[PDB]
Design an enzyme around this catalytic site. Sequence first.
Site, PDB file in Angstrom:
ATOM      1  N   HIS A   1       0.835  -1.187   0.000  1.00  0.00           N
ATOM      2  CA  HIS A   1       0.000   0.000   0.000  1.00  0.00           C
ATOM      3  C   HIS A   1       0.871   1.239   0.000  1.00  0.00           C
ATOM      4  CE1 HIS A   1       1.007  -0.433   4.326  1.00  0.00           C
ATOM      5  NE2 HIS A   1       0.990   0.888   4.294  1.00  0.00           N
TER       6      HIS A   1
ATOM      7  N   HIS B   1      -5.494  -2.730   4.878  1.00  0.00           N
ATOM      8  CA  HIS B   1      -5.646  -1.585   3.993  1.00  0.00           C
ATOM      9  C   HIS B   1      -4.778  -1.625   2.745  1.00  0.00           C
ATOM     10  CE1 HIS B   1      -2.130  -0.003   6.182  1.00  0.00           C
ATOM     11  NE2 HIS B   1      -2.032   0.972   5.297  1.00  0.00           N
TER      12      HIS B   1
ATOM     13  N   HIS C   1       4.599   7.418   2.540  1.00  0.00           N
ATOM     14  CA  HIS C   1       5.372   6.216   2.282  1.00  0.00           C
ATOM     15  C   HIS C   1       4.676   5.187   1.420  1.00  0.00           C
ATOM     16  CE1 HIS C   1       3.072   4.349   5.699  1.00  0.00           C
ATOM     17  NE2 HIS C   1       3.257   3.261   4.971  1.00  0.00           N
TER      18      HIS C   1
ATOM     19  N   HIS D   1       2.763  -1.010  15.163  1.00  0.00           N
ATOM     20  CA  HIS D   1       1.918   0.120  14.790  1.00  0.00           C
ATOM     21  C   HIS D   1       0.599  -0.126  15.486  1.00  0.00           C
ATOM     22  CE1 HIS D   1       3.042   2.274  10.779  1.00  0.00           C
ATOM     23  NE2 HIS D   1       3.270   3.030  11.839  1.00  0.00           N
TER      24      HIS D   1
ATOM     25  N   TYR E   1      10.387   1.998   9.211  1.00  0.00           N
ATOM     26  CA  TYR E   1      10.275   3.102   8.268  1.00  0.00           C
ATOM     27  C   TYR E   1      11.705   3.530   7.974  1.00  0.00           C
ATOM     28  CZ  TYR E   1       5.195   3.823   8.750  1.00  0.00           C
ATOM     29  OH  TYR E   1       3.827   3.669   8.672  1.00  0.00           O
TER      30      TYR E   1
ATOM     31  N   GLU F   1       8.433   1.457   3.419  1.00  0.00           N
ATOM     32  CA  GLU F   1       8.214   0.609   4.575  1.00  0.00           C
ATOM     33  C   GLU F   1       8.238  -0.884   4.282  1.00  0.00           C
ATOM     34  OE1 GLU F   1       4.065   0.543   5.538  1.00  0.00           O
ATOM     35  OE2 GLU F   1       4.425   0.189   7.671  1.00  0.00           O
TER      36      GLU F   1
HETATM   37 FE   FE2 Z   1       2.191   1.609   6.083  1.00  0.00          FE
END
Ligand code: FE2
Lengths: 288, 297, 288, 288
Positions: free
Chosen positions: A153, A200, A215, A247, A256, A266
């Site tokens: 993503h 996501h 990112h 996270h 990151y 990432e």
């Molecule tokens: Fe992410």
Amino acid sequence: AMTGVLRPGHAQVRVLNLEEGIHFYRNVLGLVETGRDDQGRVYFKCWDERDHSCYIIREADTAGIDFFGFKVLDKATLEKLDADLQAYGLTTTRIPAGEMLETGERVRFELPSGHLIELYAEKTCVGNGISEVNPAPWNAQREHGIAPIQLDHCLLYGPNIAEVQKIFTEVLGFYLVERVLSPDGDSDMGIWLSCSHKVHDIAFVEYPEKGKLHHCSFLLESWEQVLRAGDIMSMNEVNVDIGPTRHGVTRGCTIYAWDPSGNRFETFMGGYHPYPDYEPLSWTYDNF
Amino acid sequence: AMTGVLRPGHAQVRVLNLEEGIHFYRNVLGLVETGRDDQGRVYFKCWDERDHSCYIIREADTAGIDFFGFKVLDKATLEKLDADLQAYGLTTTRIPAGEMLETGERVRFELPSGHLIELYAEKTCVGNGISEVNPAPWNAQREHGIAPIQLDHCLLYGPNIAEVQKIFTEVLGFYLVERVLSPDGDSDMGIWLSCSHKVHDIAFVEYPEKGKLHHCSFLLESWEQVLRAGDIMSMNEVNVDIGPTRHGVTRGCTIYAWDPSGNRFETFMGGYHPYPDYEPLSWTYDNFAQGLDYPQR
Amino acid sequence: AMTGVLRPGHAQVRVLNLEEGIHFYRNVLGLVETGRDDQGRVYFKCWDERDHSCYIIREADTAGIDFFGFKVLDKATLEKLDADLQAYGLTTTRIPAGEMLETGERVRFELPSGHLIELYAEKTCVGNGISEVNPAPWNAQREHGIAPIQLDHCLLYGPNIAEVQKIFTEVLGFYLVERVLSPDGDSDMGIWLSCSHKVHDIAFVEYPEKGKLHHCSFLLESWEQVLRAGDIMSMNEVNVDIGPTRHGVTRGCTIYAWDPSGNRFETFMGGYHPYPDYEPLSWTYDNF
Amino acid sequence: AMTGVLRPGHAQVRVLNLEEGIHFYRNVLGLVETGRDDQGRVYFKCWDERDHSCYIIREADTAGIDFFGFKVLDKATLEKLDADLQAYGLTTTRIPAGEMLETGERVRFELPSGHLIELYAEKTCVGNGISEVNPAPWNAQREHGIAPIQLDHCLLYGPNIAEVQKIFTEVLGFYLVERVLSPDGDSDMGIWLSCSHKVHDIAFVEYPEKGKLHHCSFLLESWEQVLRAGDIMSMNEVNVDIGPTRHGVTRGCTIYAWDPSGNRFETFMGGYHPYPDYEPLSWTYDNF
Ligand SMILES: [Fe+2]
Ligand SMILES: [Fe+2]
Ligand SMILES: [Fe+2]
Ligand SMILES: [Fe+2]
């Protein structure tokens, strides 16, 4: 079934120094190069994916993202979405097939957050380098550099997130999986959107500066491969943003890091399995 | 967008003894008990799932699976699927809402392989035991027994897999991800079908007896969790079929173990991410004959 | 402090085909080749060890182990052990320096079980391929083949375990960590001995035939690496004895596999951290 | 063999509040409470260790370490060690047996860095809560809180590191595994000492204030158990110092968090396998 918009297809990022970017991505991140075009861009794909590209590099005066595209089910679904996007009020542009190597035509438009987004139905299937019959148990690309499994993503920084979400959920068939509530009154200061059953496929955070890239993300196979991507980041003196950690939002175990040009990328893994019949999870602004 | 048929929703399995059946599943497998009905069925769900149940146990004289159901996007998708299954030629049965605790009505029907499959649009959402605002990544439940994440699929043994395939791909919107090619005079001896971007939501292997359940499967967070389930099975003197291993015909690292009634189950993790536009992978019969899903062994 | 007998130092095994055993250990097991002598023996060392060698292969008409040596703290210690072994009654043989590449002189003796054991105080430190200053945590070597971290131990099969236990505990300074009890009539069928704070540095199992080798052992970093080892073995058609599993009598998560010559070897990780003051654990015969 | 000083025996630390310390170590860290005496100290040991205690907390006005004791091979080794300390120029106090619950007499002295060190030969072996015959494949204690496997070591802050180094390697039979150079006029701003084949059972860093405690360390089973320690810490709202990451000096994959009273503690895993015949590793001041 997985219909409509299926998955993130490609991100075309800007680098300050091509050779430095080609080496970084090919040898540190471990993306597999599939081609270079007469326009100066170099095409990269994750080793286990099947399509020709998922990340394109291009030299220019600044870092950041040019655009982000998604592959859809089929050509019929492409025209359908083109028409719905227009019916919604967006001006659609059609980049002719072949403008990108091995890539059919794509429906392009711009979001209120100022990001360029694409939709395409066709893209070559070069495969993953493994046999289609009794695919071997081990393969050498698996361990070349960090070698992530797929473009997972991207997270974008832009101004009108609400209008952004309505477009994605009301037209593109995505659903809100997670969101960060505003400090007070009102809206969401961050949204994580899925067009499948992944936590996501794209996320947007509220910000003034239009069209900024936070990112692009690559999925890894385990927590240990994350620690490993970390070791490979140091060995190559890669500036790290936030070392390996969890996270809250997404539950992703991630790292990151920065590109030689400033683009944040990432490498993570982890997350639950949401579906379209699920209510989203929310985080209070003070926890964001 | 995930549409039409969404995912495995529940499996109703037959246990030779209801009491020892509840202890094993809730204490060893780690499933969460969510309710018990009048017929004496006891319902469970993986801790991380959101719906009332994914695994229901019923006392009986025979082990095996009573039926296997998928959750569909919505009421409209359900009536449509019911309609298309009729049009294709299958007879449909309609189970009234409430017949199963917290569940809407479901569309049932028998496959050419003998197994009963069901489709439903509604089942109460009970949550995953974790707050919906500022949720933690897990709670004590993740460490109660094996504590699988979800009912991943099931694999069934039946006689007319070519037709079962047709039914699942042409009517139900599934696609073939992997198959075991016939010994030579080709055909398909095994199929792995997905209605999502999972390697498979269900699988079928050619076999004389109708309605055979090879196993139900539950997903674990990681390879270490798979190692941990093995320790937990050992401690509980569970009878393991084939210890932790690199599956093969699916890229999964798994353990096949047995129910106190004889119902095989699977705890695994890992896999690639196929999408509807991909072409399937193939396994030659001899290769497959060495696999974990081979009728023999 | 670690005194007297420090750790397994080398294992010399017989292979039916020299060059076929070389490709395997350097490409499948992933050991690092350090040299080849006139006797036609080739030397290997795990990448993270520092000594010139830990595993030696010699072409012969029969598979099995020739000898297994332990490194000791120093010359003084080696001369002392030499005397102590003789004072117990064991006939001692002294192998001259350089008889083995980069190896000092060793003390060799035969156990009641039929196996040959060696002690040496000197072997050239060639290093672990990483720098002595500001060392990275690992390098490419860690991903060439299975690539174990160290020669961990070996399990030997032979007839006089009781007396073997005696020698190791009373002369060599080892201690019983675990033991497998004989059926009802109590004696010791199996014996796991340590000369450090590892579960074991060597192990014996009562068996009527002398000098038999059950397996040499190699340590991996994680359960994930054991799973990876299984994949590499599968890809190379290695004949695997007993797949990845949790061994009770050691807690190790291991894989037993076969050399192209029939010499069994193991890759595992895990266990606990025992010390000289701990009483040993026991297993009943049936459980065994 | 493991002779002389075997391993870190125990650490007594002060907690501003007994009840909150008892809750944290018992329910968050997952140490097993073994006892409480008449002076107000409560006793803890790791679930997998065997001796009655490795961590003892006391209610005081400040947060620091009272003392840190090392267990030795035997009584003769204790008398032996004490005599060499004195012959070294260190006065030694003799704490009588019983003073500390289930603990025998112990030799105590002070380092030039201001910290108090103990040496003892006896402490009651309570076991690890698992049977000694056919030990179960796993127990519920293993998942009670973070639940480390052992008191791995401690890192102390104090002056005259050079002096302390020499007492350790010249009197206690420890040895240097790693050091951190000073900018120039090279001496050691930091040292990592081992009295076994562990990267370190103790370490010191040059600090103006004497007797300071930087952190007590606990060993975990794997990189995933650390991430788990991370999650459990967050869930309990424990302030974490430096998130989960790779160290470099030791290679240890760790996380530092704080005690409900301010004492820093550690839960890590990983590292190589050094032995006394190895030359220490060095880090230039710039990396440190
Ligand atoms: Fe992410
Ligand atoms: Fe399965
Ligand atoms: Fe072994
Ligand atoms: Fe530490």
